[PDB]
Ligand binder design. Sequence first.
Ligand SMILES: CNC(=O)c1c(-c2ccc(F)cc2)oc2cc(N(C)S(C)(=O)=O)c(-c3ccc4c(n3)-c3cc5c(F)cccc5n3CO4)cc12
Length: 559
Amino acid sequence: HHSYTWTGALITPCAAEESKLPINPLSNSLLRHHNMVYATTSRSASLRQKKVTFDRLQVLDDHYRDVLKEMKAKASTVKAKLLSVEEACKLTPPHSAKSKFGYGAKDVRNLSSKAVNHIHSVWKDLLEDTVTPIDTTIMAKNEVFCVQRKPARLIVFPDLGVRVCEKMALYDVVSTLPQVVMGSSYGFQYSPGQRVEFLVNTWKSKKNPMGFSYDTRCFDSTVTENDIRVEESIYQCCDLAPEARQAIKSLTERLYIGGPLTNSKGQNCGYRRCRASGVLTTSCGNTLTCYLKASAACRAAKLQDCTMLVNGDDLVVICESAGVQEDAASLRAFTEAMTRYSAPPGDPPQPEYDLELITSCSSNVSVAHDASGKRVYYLTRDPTTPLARAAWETARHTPVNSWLGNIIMYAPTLWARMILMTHFFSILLAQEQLEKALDCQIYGACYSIEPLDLPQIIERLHGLSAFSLHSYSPGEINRVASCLRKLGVPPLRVWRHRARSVRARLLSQGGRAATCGKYLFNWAVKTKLKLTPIPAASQLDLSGWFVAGYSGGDIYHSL
Ligand SMILES: CNC(=O)c1c(-c2ccc(F)cc2)oc2cc(N(C)S(C)(=O)=O)c(-c3ccc4c(n3)-c3cc5c(F)cccc5n3CO4)cc12
C-alpha cells in the first residue's frame, strides 16, 4: 500500500539548473549575505523520493462516514456545467508545458486546428476508455530558499491535452462544489482581508477560544486510493451532464487514483498510487479530504464547537476550550484519529489561546492601527523566503514573479510595503516597465498583472487600511529586523529614504504612476496625505480569482 513505486531511473531536468544565487549590480542593494540563498535542483530529487514514499494504513470509523454522508448531501445540490473546448482553452496559462503531440499553450489559446483536434481526440478517448492509466511527467521543482538545505519538491502532471480535458469536466465542479460542501470553512473563497475577518470573527464567536494548526507530513503521499475514490463520489453527487460523469469517472480511474511516472527524457521512473501534484483536482481534493478527516477527528476527539479553515492541506481548528489540561488531551485524540485516517502530523499540534500565535500557510495574524488609530488585523509571515526569492528575481527574470505575488498577498505588512514595493518600483522606473504586465504565480493559478494596477488591486483585497497602517506590533518589527540582519538586507531606515525618492520619481511621472506614488509610498512621507478610495478599483473584474484555488490546476487569469 505504498505511496510510490520506483525503478531507479533518475528524475531528470528539462533544462540547466542554477543552484547558486545570481549576482546583478542591483543585488547588494537588497541582500548582502548571498551564500544563504540557494535554489533546489533535480540533484536533490532522490532525497524527496525517499521522504514521499511510505505505506499508508487506513481505518475508517463511523465518524468518517457520518461526515461523508453530510458532505454528499450538500454536494447533491450542486449543478455544474461542462466547459466548452474554447472555455477550457482560454483558461490555459500562456507559458504552460507544451504537448508531446506537437502543440503548445499558445496553440491551445488561439484555438489552432492541431491543438483543438487533439483535445477532441483525448476527450473522446476519455469517454470510450475508463481503465488505461494516463501517463504523467515527474519534475523536480526549482524553488529558492534560505539556509537553516531542503531537497527538490516534486510535481506530477499529465500532458497539455489532458489538462484541457480535466478543465472541461471539472473546472465548474472545483469552482462551485467546495463552498457548498464546506461553507465558511473553504479557505480559497476569501481575499486576504476576508480571511483575517473570518478568523477574528470566529475567534470572537467562542466564549473561551482555543485553536491550533494541523499540518500533515507529505499530505499528497497520505492521500490513498479510497480517498481519491471518495472524492469522486462527492463530485458524482452533483447534477452533471452524462458526458461529464463519464469523463470524471475516467479521469479518476486513469489519472487521479494513480498511474505511471516518466521523466523529461522519457524514462519510466516508477508508479504513483497517491495524489498527483499537478492535477486540477489537487487543491480541491486535498481540501475536501482534509476537511472530511479533520471534521471526523473533531467528533472522535469530542472537541467542543469547532469551526475550521481548510486550504488544501493546511488546516486550522478554532474551538471552545474545555480547559488547558482537557484541550491538550482532546488534541492528542484529534492527532490519533487523524493518524488512523492516514494523515499524521509532521510536528505535533499545539493548543493556542491567542489568535496571533497560530501559524498556517507559513502565516499568522497581526495588529497595527489605521490613520484614525483604529486596531486593524492583517495576515503577515516571516519575510525570509519572500526576500530570498526577491533577491533571486532581482538578477534573473522568472516565470513566477514571487515579489509581485508577495506584494498582492502581503500589502498591509511592514516588509512588503517598505522593502518589496520600494525595491521593485525602483527597478520598474529604471527599466520603464511599470506598464509592462507580469505573469505571477500565486499558491496555484497564474495571473497577468500590470504593476500600475497594484493600488486598485490592493484596495479591493485589503482595503484603504493597507496604505494607512502604522504602529505595528513590536514582535512583528523584531521578526523583520532580525530577518534583515540574517540576510544582510539594508535596515528599514534605509528603505524609508529610498521610498521617498521612488515616491517623488513616480509622482513626477503623473497619472497611474503618481497614483502608485501617492498610495503605495504614503507611509514614507512625514507630511502625509489623507487618501480616498480609487475610482478604478470597483471597475476591476476580480471574478474567478477567489472563487477557488488551482494548485497544479494550470489556471490563467488576465485583466
Ligand atoms: C488554513 N489556513 C489558512 O486559511 C491561512 C492562514 C492562517 C490560518 C490560521 C491562522 F491562525 C493564521 C493564518 O493564513 C493564510 C495566508 C494565506 N496567504 C498566502 S494570504 C496572506 O492570504 O495571501 C493563505 C492563502 C492560501 C491560498 C491562496 C491564498 N492565500 C491567496 C491569496 C491571494 C491573493 F491575494 C491574490 C490572488 C490569489 C491569492 N491566493 C490563492 O491561494 C491561506 C492562509
